[PDB]
Amino acid sequence: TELQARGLTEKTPDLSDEDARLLTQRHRVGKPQFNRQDHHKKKRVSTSWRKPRGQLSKQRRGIKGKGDTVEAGFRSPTAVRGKHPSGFEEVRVHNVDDLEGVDGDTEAVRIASKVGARKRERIEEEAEDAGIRVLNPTYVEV
Amino acid sequence: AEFDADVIVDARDCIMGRVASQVAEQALDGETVAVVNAERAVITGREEQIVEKYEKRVDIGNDNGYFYPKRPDGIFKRTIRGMLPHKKQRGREAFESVRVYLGNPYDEDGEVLDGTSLDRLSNIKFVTLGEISETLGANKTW
Amino acid sequence: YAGLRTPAESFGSGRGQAHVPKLDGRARRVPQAVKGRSAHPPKTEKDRS
Amino acid sequence: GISYSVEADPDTTAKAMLRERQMSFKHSKAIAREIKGKTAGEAVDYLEAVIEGDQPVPFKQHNSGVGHKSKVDGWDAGRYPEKASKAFLDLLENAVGNADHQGFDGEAMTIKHVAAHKVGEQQGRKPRAMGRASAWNSPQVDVELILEEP
RNA sequence: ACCCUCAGAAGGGAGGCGAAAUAGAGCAUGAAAUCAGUUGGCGAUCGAGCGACAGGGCAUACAAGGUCCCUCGACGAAUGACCGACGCGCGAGCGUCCAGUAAGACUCACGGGAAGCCGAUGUUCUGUCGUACGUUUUGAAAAACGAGCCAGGGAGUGUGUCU
RNA sequence: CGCUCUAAUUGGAUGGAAGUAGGGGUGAAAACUCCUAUGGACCGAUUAGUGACGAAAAUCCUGGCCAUAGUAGCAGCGAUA
RNA sequence: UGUCCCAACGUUGGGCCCGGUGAACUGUACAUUCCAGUGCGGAGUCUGGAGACACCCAGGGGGAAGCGAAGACCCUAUGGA
Numbered sequence: 001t002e003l004q005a006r007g008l009t010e011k012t013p014d015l016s017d018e019d020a021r022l023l024t025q026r027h028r029v030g031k032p033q034f035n036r037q038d039h040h041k042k043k044r045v046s047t048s049w050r051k052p053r054g055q056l057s058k059q060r061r062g063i064k065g066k067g068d069t070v071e072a073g074f075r076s077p078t079a080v081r082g083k084h085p086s087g088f089e090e091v092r093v094h095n096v097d098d099l100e101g102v103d104g105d106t107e108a109v110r111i112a113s114k115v116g117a118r119k120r121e122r123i124e125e126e127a128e129d130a131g132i133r134v135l136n137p138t139y140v141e142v
Numbered sequence: 143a144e145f146d147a148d149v150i151v152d153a154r155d156c157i158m159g160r161v162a163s164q165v166a167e168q169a170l171d172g173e174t175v176a177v178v179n180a181e182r183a184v185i186t187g188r189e190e191q192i193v194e195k196y197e198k199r200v201d202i203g204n205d206n207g208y209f210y211p212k213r214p215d216g217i218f219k220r221t222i223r224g225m226l227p228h229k230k231q232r233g234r235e236a237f238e239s240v241r242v243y244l245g246n247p248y249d250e251d252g253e254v255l256d257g258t259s260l261d262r263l264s265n266i267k268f269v270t271l272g273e274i275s276e277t278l279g280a281n282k283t284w
Numbered sequence: 285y286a287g288l289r290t291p292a293e294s295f296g297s298g299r300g301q302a303h304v305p306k307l308d309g310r311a312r313r314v315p316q317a318v319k320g321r322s323a324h325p326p327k328t329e330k331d332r333s
Numbered sequence: 334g335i336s337y338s339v340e341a342d343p344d345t346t347a348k349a350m351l352r353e354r355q356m357s358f359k360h361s362k363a364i365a366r367e368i369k370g371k372t373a374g375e376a377v378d379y380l381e382a383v384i385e386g387d388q389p390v391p392f393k394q395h396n397s398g399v400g401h402k403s404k405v406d407g408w409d410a411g412r413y414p415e416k417a418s419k420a421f422l423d424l425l426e427n428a429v430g431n432a433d434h435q436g437f438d439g440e441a442m443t444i445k446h447v448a449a450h451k452v453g454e455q456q457g458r459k460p461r462a463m464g465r466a467s468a469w470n471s472p473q474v475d476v477e478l479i480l481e482e483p
Numbered sequence: 484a485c486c487c488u489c490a491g492a493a494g495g496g497a498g499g500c501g502a503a504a505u506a507g508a509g510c511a512u513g514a515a516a517u518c519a520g521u522u523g524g525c526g527a528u529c530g531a532g533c534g535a536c537a538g539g540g541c542a543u544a545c546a547a548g549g550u551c552c553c554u555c556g557a558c559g560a561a562u563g564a565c566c567g568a569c570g571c572g573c574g575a576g577c578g579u580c581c582a583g584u585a586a587g588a589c590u591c592a593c594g595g596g597a598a599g600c601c602g603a604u605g606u607u608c609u610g611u612c613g614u615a616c617g618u619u620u621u622g623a624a625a626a627a628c629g630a631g632c633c634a635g636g637g638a639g640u641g642u643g644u645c646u
Numbered sequence: 647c648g649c650u651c652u653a654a655u656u657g658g659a660u661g662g663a664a665g666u667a668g669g670g671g672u673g674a675a676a677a678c679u680c681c682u683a684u685g686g687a688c689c690g691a692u693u694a695g696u697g698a699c700g701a702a703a704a705u706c707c708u709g710g711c712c713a714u715a716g717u718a719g720c721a722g723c724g725a726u727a
Numbered sequence: 728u729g730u731c732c733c734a735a736c737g738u739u740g741g742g743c744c745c746g747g748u749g750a751a752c753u754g755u756a757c758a759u760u761c762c763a764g765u766g767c768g769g770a771g772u773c774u775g776g777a778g779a780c781a782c783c784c785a786g787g788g789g790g791a792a793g794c795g796a797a798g799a800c801c802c803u804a805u806g807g808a
């Protein structure tokens with residue numbers, strides 16, 4: 001009578017002490033929006049980041065208050081970079097064969113959006129049986 | 143009429159500026175202050191030059207305006223305003239929780255703040271706010 | 285000759301208009317104009333072997 | 334053209350629309366604004382008084398150069414848009430007619446929703462001096478009305 | 484189609500077809516600028532590159548993020564005391580000891596708590612910094628030049644030869 | 647990093663593709679991805695190619711649109727009707 | 728002899744209010760400003776102060792070095808006629 005997501009939704013990965021620390025750091029430090037200079041002053045200018053090239057640009061000059069400039073110094077920890085917030089490493093899946101080789105303790109799977117309901121159902125049930133969590137599960141009424 | 147002053151300061155024979163500096167400090171600390179006997183407050187200096195300064199202020203002005211108070215009343219309050227960021231919320235809040243009065247409309251005798259008192263016995267070059275207001279043309283309503 | 289088949293001329297300064305060739309009050313020829321020539325288009329002469 | 338921008342329960346609701354009316358879109362906003370919440374009947378009397386010139390329509394947004402009117406309350410500028418008013422009376426006549434044919438008491442229904450939309454311009458061209466021409470267009474308005482039982 | 488309305492082959496209402504009329508005639512999809520109505524936040528005593536980073540109010544269906552708060556305790560870099568004891572200094576105050584101790588960012592463990600609750604998003608308030616952008620220029624916020632706004636279009640290419 | 651089309655290898659889609667709107671996650675970032683709604687037929691990935699491949703600007707071009715504004719004009723003429 | 732001293736009253740058409748019709752110029756953004764200062768030495772936007780409740784109508788045009796025109800003057804170009 002209520003919606004329930006298929007599979008091991010609550011499953012959590014097991015991470016080394018170091019990795020869990022680095023993951024928690026990433027989440028605590030965060031990073032700036034890094035949106036393009038003045039994107040908010042003109043509608044024709046979008047949020048997508050572009051290097052400020054004006055010789056007098058205030059951002060380019062690094063004037064405090066004008067936003068952070070993209071630099072290598074902002075990179076996230078090597079060990080956690082790219083990890084879903086849950087800590088899992090994602091693996092993109094298009095069919096059942098894509099599930100082969102996936103470590104349910106370490107990786108979680110994300111079914112491509114294009115895959116249809118018919119194929120999802122099969123992927124979702126064999127994923128669960130292989131002990132793999134599906135990040136974008138179908139919600140059935142049970 | 144009726145002002146729950148946490149503090150009542152007596153200005154009689156006290157150096158206005160010094161008093162004002164303390165009343166601001168307190169008003170920003172959230173204290174409700176009432177300054178009494180403004181007319182009897184005093185400012186050191188050569189009366190003649192002291193007066194020219196205030197008379198100038200009265201004459202300054204134009205269409206936009208430069209409203210300068212003549213009564214010892216206002217004079218003292220404006221002085222306090224100059225020591226507060228009166229255009230900021232916090233500052234206008236403090237300024238508004240401060241009121242100056244001619245004479246003392248309270249029952250309690252106001253207190254004398256440390257280092258604000260002037261020794262008439264050892265000082266001859268100074269003036270009373272009331273004296274200044276009379277010179278400015280104010281109406282001696284005290 | 286695509287986009288070059290016209291006698292469009294630019295009026296030059298004087299009317300608060302950019303110096304763009306125009307004909308019948310319609311812009312033409314130049315790359316940035318609609319119906320104008322392709323600046324660096326594909327070329328039959330190119331050796332693609 | 335428009336579609337009803339608001340959901341309406343058919344059992345306690347009567348609908349109506351004007352299509353591509355060539356009249357002031359600015360006047361229409363004002364009028365809609367003013368009669369919303371009124372009883373279809375009250376609305377009719379009001380608009381007729383407007384047309385008669387005994388009742389001003391507050392012009393709250395498109396008021397530049399408009400002269401004040403004493404009868405306007407809570408505001409100042411106002412006029413007597415008779416053309417747009419007549420078109421609204423047509424709109425109301427239809428709605429109240431539709432409402433009766435359904436068994437409701439038309440006149441007593443409340444104007445739940447009423448809004449004007451600028452669907453287009455009948456373009457026109459006016460010759461000007463120096464060998465040049467400039468636009469001379471007419472607005473085309475659509476307007477929805479939803480009557481609801483009290 | 485039929486019926487009501489209407490000056491009415493108009494339009495509108497009701498209804499019919501079709502998977503779909505938000506496929507109803509320049510009718511596939513239906514962006515932005517922008518308009519009507521409406522919801523959230525602000526609002527008729529207050530200041531202007533419209534934001535970045537911090538932190539508060541208010542607002543929030545699900546989904547695709549799940550964290551967050553307080554007691555205590557463990558760990559604990561640089562830094563690092565109060566009080567008290569003694570001894571100096573005209574004095575503000577300092578020295579020795581207590582002690583590299585207590586404290587000390589992050590992280591973790593037990594227990595307890597939140598689900599508009601944490602993140603996030605909308606808006607608004609406070610703090611810090613902040614006079615667009617690009618171009619010209621020794622020097623641009625510039626009273627130097629360009630743009631009303633948005634969408635789409637808009638500029639190192641080919642052959643030969645040489646290196 | 648992203649765009650077009652070609653080839654090899656290999657996948658998704660009417661049990662709902664592209665696109666669009668709003669929203670969630672990742673990446674320092676170019677950008678990648680997922681959810682819901684809309685849509686109703688196409689769409690990718692890896693490798694090796696391809697090139698009329700990336701815009702905020704040029705008094706840039708073309709189209710659409712807002713303010714201007716219910717404003718100016720619809721009076722002025724020896725023909726005041 | 729209203730050119731002037733020195734302006735007045737009046738006449739007609741506008742102007743103002745109402746119905747109908749209904750453009751254009753112009754717009755980086757923000758914008759209730761004033762006095763000073765500062766800055767590429769001529770600032771509504773910087774700095775310090777002062778003033779400042781919001782909206783609207785009519786006016787005469789002080790400022791936006793207002794709008795209109797890639798300065799005709801001057802110089803420069805191994806420019807033109």
Ligand SMILES: [Cl-]
Nearest residue numbers: 071072075674
């Ligand atoms: Cl890197």
Ligand SMILES: [Cl-]
Nearest residue numbers: 203204207208
């Ligand atoms: Cl004044």
Ligand SMILES: [Cl-]
Nearest residue numbers: 227228229230
């Ligand atoms: Cl202030």
Ligand SMILES: [Cl-]
Nearest residue numbers: 264265266267
């Ligand atoms: Cl003395």
Ligand SMILES: [Cl-]
Nearest residue numbers: 358359451472
């Ligand atoms: Cl309009």
Ligand SMILES: [Cl-]
Nearest residue numbers: 021025589590
């Ligand atoms: Cl840590």
Ligand SMILES: [Cl-]
Nearest residue numbers: 324638639640
């Ligand atoms: Cl190049």
Ligand SMILES: [Mg+2]
Nearest residue numbers: 039042043045
């Ligand atoms: Mg933008």
Ligand SMILES: [Mg+2]
Nearest residue numbers: 286287319320
């Ligand atoms: Mg062409």
Ligand SMILES: [Mg+2]
Nearest residue numbers: 397398399400
């Ligand atoms: Mg007017």
Ligand SMILES: [Mg+2]
Nearest residue numbers: 462463464465
């Ligand atoms: Mg002619």
Ligand SMILES: [Mg+2]
Nearest residue numbers: 510511512513
């Ligand atoms: Mg369509």
Ligand SMILES: [Mg+2]
Nearest residue numbers: 530774775776
């Ligand atoms: Mg200021």
Ligand SMILES: [Mg+2]
Nearest residue numbers: 620621622767
């Ligand atoms: Mg120079």
Ligand SMILES: [Mg+2]
Nearest residue numbers: 635636637701
């Ligand atoms: Mg483009």
Ligand SMILES: [Mg+2]
Nearest residue numbers: 655656692693
């Ligand atoms: Mg391959």
